[PDB]
């Protein structure tokens, strides 16, 4: 009975300078142990936010996270070329740790 | 739930976590993580045991808590409050 994570929007197109929000849903309450990762076209992955809203060292303020219970979201402001990537959420509440399918952002 | 096993013998205190058999066990002492690869080599964690060699009452008394890998210290709800002296012929 592992926790299923879902990101209903598989792909999103936006414009430079815009602000977008990516939704993430858990099948059970994950008590804010929700993290966000950014994967670049070359396959490199970086941590962005952990525990729903804490920014990881080196991550710019344009990234913010929110959510509670089963509903979470990542908000990315002032979009730039460097932000073109796939964003993934992951729950860290119960083993086995699980990830959603990601949202590919094109700008 | 089973109680923590508290073994005080000579100058060594050995605590044994109650449950979670088959799981890696982690520890905190007064809200500080211990049992890993830290500077103090008189503190050892093996299986469900935490060994405190040359135990110091002043620095090592206090709250101890164990939890299985996969769990969070913040969620632990069963603590050991240890106040012990390792005096010769304590009896």
């Amino acid at each position, epitope marked *: 009975m592992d926790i299923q994570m879902t990101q209903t929007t598989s792909s999103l197109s936006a414009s430079l300078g815009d602000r977008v929000t990516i939704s993430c849903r858990a099948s059970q309450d994950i008590r804010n142990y929700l993290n966000w990762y950014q994967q670049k076209p070359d396959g490199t992955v*970086k941590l962005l936010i*952990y525990y729903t809203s804490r920014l990881h060292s080196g991550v710019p303020s344009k990234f913010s996270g929110s959510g509670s219970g089963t509903d979470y979201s990542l908000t990315i402001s002032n979009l730039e070329q460097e932000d073109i990537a796939t964003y993934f959420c992951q729950q860290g509440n119960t083993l086995p740790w699980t990830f959603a399918g990601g949202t590919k952002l094109e700008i | 739930q089973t109680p923590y096993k508290v073994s005080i013998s000579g100058t060594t205190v050995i605590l044994t976590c109650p449950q979670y058999p088959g799981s890696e066990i982690l520890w905190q002492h007064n809200d500080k993580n211990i049992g890993g690869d830290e500077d103090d080599k008189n503190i050892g964690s093996d299986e469900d045991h935490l060994s405190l060699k040359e135990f110091s009452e002043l620095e090592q008394s206090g709250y101890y808590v164990c939890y299985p890998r996969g769990s969070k210290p913040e969620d632990a709800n069963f603590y050991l409050y240890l106040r012990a002296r390792v005096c010769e012929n304590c009896m």
Partner: nanobody, 122 residues
Framework: EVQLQQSGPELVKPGASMKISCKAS????????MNWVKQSHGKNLEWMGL????????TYNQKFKDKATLTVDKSSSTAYMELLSLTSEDSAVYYC???????????????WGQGTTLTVFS
């Protein structure tokens, strides 16, 4: 700087086994947990398991316990994952990723290797 450097791509036939590696630099190997993550179809991510480098004790996702064997070599700061009884369904990119040593931070991955592509075919 802090980095996880993984071994190169591997091509293997079904039924074979393959051990891939992950070299840590810029930080104390034994002061953090090492995790392995599988990405198939260039999207779907799955946490396979973790290993405590200091103690050499592993904890697996039941889905991959039969498929993987995790080990570490403390002397060289290298983590290994051996993949067993390979099938084409095991073709994917595998990542090693670091997390905290203790439960206060072992559940989010702060440093990721570049990934190792494994392709199983005949």
């Amino acid at each position: 700087e802090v980095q996880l450097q993984q071994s190169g791509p591997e091509l293997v036939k079904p039924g074979a086994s393959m051990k891939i590696s992950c070299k840590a630099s810029g930080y104390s190997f034994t002061g953090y947990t090492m995790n392995w993550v599988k990405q198939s179809h260039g999207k779907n991510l799955e946490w396979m398991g973790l290993i405590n480098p200091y103690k050499g004790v592993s904890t697996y996702n039941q889905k991959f316990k039969d498929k993987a064997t995790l080990t570490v070599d403390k002397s060289s700061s290298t983590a290994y994952m051996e993949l067993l009884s390979l099938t084409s369904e095991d073709s994917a990119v595998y990542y090693c990723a670091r997390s905290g040593y203790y439960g206060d931070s072992d559940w989010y991955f702060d440093v990721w290797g570049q990934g190792t592509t494994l392709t199983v075919f005949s």
